[PDB]
Design an enzyme around this catalytic site. Structure first.
Site, mmCIF file in Angstrom:
data_model
loop_
_atom_site.group_PDB
_atom_site.id
_atom_site.type_symbol
_atom_site.label_atom_id
_atom_site.label_comp_id
_atom_site.label_asym_id
_atom_site.label_seq_id
_atom_site.Cartn_x
_atom_site.Cartn_y
_atom_site.Cartn_z
ATOM 1 C CE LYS B 105 -3.540 2.728 2.783
ATOM 2 N NZ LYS B 105 -4.037 2.571 4.134
ATOM 3 C CG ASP B 233 -10.801 6.915 11.030
ATOM 4 O OD1 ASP B 233 -10.697 7.873 10.053
ATOM 5 O OD2 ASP B 233 -11.457 7.077 12.006
HETATM 6 N N1 LIG Z 1 -4.290 -6.789 4.246
HETATM 7 C C1 LIG Z 1 -5.080 -6.642 3.346
HETATM 8 N N2 LIG Z 1 -5.326 -7.802 2.612
HETATM 9 C C2 LIG Z 1 -6.359 -7.733 1.702
HETATM 10 N N3 LIG Z 1 -7.040 -6.633 1.158
HETATM 11 C C3 LIG Z 1 -6.707 -5.636 1.556
HETATM 12 C C4 LIG Z 1 -5.822 -5.312 2.857
HETATM 13 N N4 LIG Z 1 -5.661 -3.937 3.122
HETATM 14 C C5 LIG Z 1 -6.750 -3.552 2.270
HETATM 15 N N5 LIG Z 1 -7.293 -4.355 1.488
HETATM 16 C C6 LIG Z 1 -8.061 -3.892 0.398
HETATM 17 O O1 LIG Z 1 -8.072 -2.464 -0.099
HETATM 18 C C7 LIG Z 1 -9.275 -1.759 0.596
HETATM 19 C C8 LIG Z 1 -8.917 -0.299 1.238
HETATM 20 O O2 LIG Z 1 -7.950 -0.525 2.334
HETATM 21 P P1 LIG Z 1 -7.532 0.595 3.200
HETATM 22 O O3 LIG Z 1 -6.185 0.124 3.751
HETATM 23 O O4 LIG Z 1 -8.641 0.549 4.050
HETATM 24 O O5 LIG Z 1 -7.462 1.602 2.195
HETATM 25 P P2 LIG Z 1 -7.598 3.324 2.563
HETATM 26 O O6 LIG Z 1 -7.085 3.925 1.197
HETATM 27 O O7 LIG Z 1 -6.754 3.456 3.834
HETATM 28 N N6 LIG Z 1 -9.013 3.661 2.738
HETATM 29 P P3 LIG Z 1 -9.773 4.810 3.733
HETATM 30 O O8 LIG Z 1 -10.562 3.908 4.945
HETATM 31 O O9 LIG Z 1 -10.768 5.814 3.140
HETATM 32 O O10 LIG Z 1 -8.793 5.429 4.659
HETATM 33 C C9 LIG Z 1 -9.863 -2.736 1.476
HETATM 34 O O11 LIG Z 1 -11.363 -2.570 1.671
HETATM 35 C C10 LIG Z 1 -9.361 -4.146 0.951
HETATM 36 O O12 LIG Z 1 -10.448 -4.457 -0.072
HETATM 37 MN MN LIG Z 2 -9.791 1.406 5.519
HETATM 38 MN MN LIG Z 3 -6.742 4.760 5.660
#
Ligand SMILES: Nc1ncnc2c1ncn2[C@@H]1O[C@H](COP(=O)(O)OP(=O)(O)NP(=O)(O)O)[C@@H](O)[C@H]1O
Ligand SMILES: [Mn+2]
Ligand SMILES: [Mn+2]
Ligand SMILES: Nc1ncnc2c1ncn2[C@@H]1O[C@H](COP(=O)(O)OP(=O)(O)NP(=O)(O)O)[C@@H](O)[C@H]1O
Ligand SMILES: [Mn+2]
Ligand SMILES: [Mn+2]
Lengths: 313, 313
Positions: B105, B233
């Site tokens: 990520k 969050d």
């Molecule tokens: N460890 C993981 N394994 C599998 N899928 C993942 C994982 N982390 C994130 N995802 C996928 O990516 C999506 C978003 O992850 P997340 O880390 O919450 O993104 P973000 O950009 O931080 N979203 P926000 O909640 O708006 O801050 C999740 O709903 C999953 O579909």
């Molecule tokens: Mn998230």
């Molecule tokens: Mn996030």
């Protein structure tokens, strides 16, 4: 233990690994002779035991030297192993690879500028002769930086055998001005004898007529090429392996010990000779700068050299 | 094709190779949590096809993340292979390792500052629970620079199986404020459903009493730890593998798919669940900065979260 040495090993390892992923074409382009790769490493509170914490490694013209190594019969994975499996040993500082295949010499930035100046013509000479030459084989050139200390290194092929030992060693220039090893020099274990020693001690090299003609033929072309580039202060390095004396405390792989020449059948002693040109990077003007700060032109040096060598064989 | 991706692959490869030469002690020292390694590469007229010509790669706290990887049952050579044998695929940008073991990520420098802030307490929590936790498994954190573009990445374990596919996916927070996937969202192939979808669509998770108690026990400790650090969050990510639907187009290695939980014997359908906490790096103050530029405190978020999850199982 020597941090500059560890950077060198690390850098060669890095360089060869990077090249292993490159598509190697049959030809070099003009930009290849102006190319380099630089790596700068900064470790903060990490890996203190293996490496300096701050170092730089630069490799000049990586594609050219990769091309040269293959032309000289050297495989990159073998070259990497020879320089990195165990440390080079000391012996301008000189080191020898642990397996005795390569010489690593510390040179000046002026030498580096001169190598760049001739590198294209050198390569094209190596192509023309299909790698069959007594010239030094330039295999790698690097710049190492360890905490304020900057050094340049060139890697070449050992003139001598990686297996068979050398008990007598000469450095011949063929100067009209007297050249001799000093008395403090002769006291060394494997002394670097010179023109006067050879002339005075009636050293003979017992090689047959075909081997002699072939050698002097190569030597002629090589030295003319050097003259043409206004290079000088180079030597014929001569090593003698005594097969008898070696049994007290005898054949070679000519694809590894490429400079070896067996004595003829009537030689007073079972001998193998190792002979090649060394130390070519001093340009006429660069010699003059070291003669000012601390007859004998390139063409004369050339003539004197070939005269002397033709005489000693 | 994606130069930032190639730098990442090159960098992970470099990092793991360097570490392979380091003596790994059983313990971390305080400086290990402040450590980094930086590499800056400049290729001039060289290697244009494989890499950008100018790039930097920085790895934060290499010893800590090496320690964590082993604690999470991950061998460094395997980790290297998963990330470098073939490119990660895209799917904050997200990528998945080619073998589906890891999530990569893209995060902000603020996130990186927060990871540093909690990294010691996180590690000590991982030690205390012997690596048995629903928390994200932080496996590597890096900074990539390619010609003016600077990005930060964190590598974690995929919540989902590297083999068994997931046909339904939920993201649960347990908010008193309504959370729902939009209609444009539900139109996605594998949509990210939320709290309202689950409550409204009467989704059931059919796991036995021992599995449920164990899970909620882990979850309790994990979420308290998060609350304590004023983090929020975060979600429970829930994946459902339908063994039946998978045969149309079913067991797992629990040492690789560490979040898997088999349904009980009376489940209406053969199912495997994959459930774990994700997205923990938003500190209370950092959420406020994104609520100002574009009741709900850490402790409340914590309570709401555990209430909801206790209800849905
Ligand atoms: N460890 C993981 N394994 C599998 N899928 C993942 C994982 N982390 C994130 N995802 C996928 O990516 C999506 C978003 O992850 P997340 O880390 O919450 O993104 P973000 O950009 O931080 N979203 P926000 O909640 O708006 O801050 C999740 O709903 C999953 O579909
Ligand atoms: Mn998230
Ligand atoms: Mn996030
Ligand atoms: N390719 C080689 N193989 C084996 N031994 C070598 C090689 N090159 C140099 N040596 C050894 O190192 C000695 C000095 O080599 P050289 O390159 O002439 O050093 P230098 O510092 O340039 N000497 P100078 O002539 O004063 O400029 C030689 O006499 C050899 O004993
Ligand atoms: Mn010399
Ligand atoms: Mn010299």
């Amino acid at each position: 233990s020597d941090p500059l040495l560890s950077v060198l090993m690390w850098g060669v390892n890095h360089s060869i690994n990077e090249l292993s992923h490159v598509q190697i074409p049959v030809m070099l382009m003009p930009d290849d002779f102006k190319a380099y790769s630089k790596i700068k490493v900064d470790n903060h509170l990490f890996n203190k035991e293996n490496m300096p914490s701050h170092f730089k490694f630069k490799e000049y013209c990586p594609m050219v030297f990769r091309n040269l190594r293959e032309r000289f019969g050297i495989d990159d994975q073998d070259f990497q192993n020879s320089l990195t499996r165990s440390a080079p040993l000391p012996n301008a500082r000189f080191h020898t690879s642990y397996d005795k295949r390569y010489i690593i010499k510390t040179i000046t930035s002026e030498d580096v500028a001169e190598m760049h100046n001739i590198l294209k013509k050198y390569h094209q000479y190596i192509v023309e002769c299909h790698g069959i030459t007594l010239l030094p084989q330039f295999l790698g050139m690097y710049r190492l930086n360890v905490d304020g200390v900057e050094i340049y290194v060139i890697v070449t092929r050992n003139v001598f055998s990686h297996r068979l030992s050398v008990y007598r060693k000469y450095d011949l220039k063929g100067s009209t001005v007297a050249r001799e090893a000093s008395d403090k020099e002769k006291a060394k274990e494997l002394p670097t004898l010179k023109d006067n020693d050879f002339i005075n001690e009636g050293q003979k090299i017992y090689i047959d007529d075909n081997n002699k003609k072939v050698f002097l033929e190569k030597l002629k072309k090589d030295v003319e090429f050097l003259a043409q580039l206004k290079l000088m202060d180079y030597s014929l390095l001569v090593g003698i392996h005594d097969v008898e004396r070696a049994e007290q405390e005898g054949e070679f792989d000519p694809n590894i010990d490429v400079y070896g020449i067996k004595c003829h059948e009537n030689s007073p002693r079972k001998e193998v000779y190792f002979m090649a040109i060394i130390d070519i990077l001093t340009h006429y003007d660069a010699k003059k700068k070291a003669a000012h700060a601390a007859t004998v032109n390139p063409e004369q040096y050339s003539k004197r050299f070939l005269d002397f060598i033709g005489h000693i064989l």
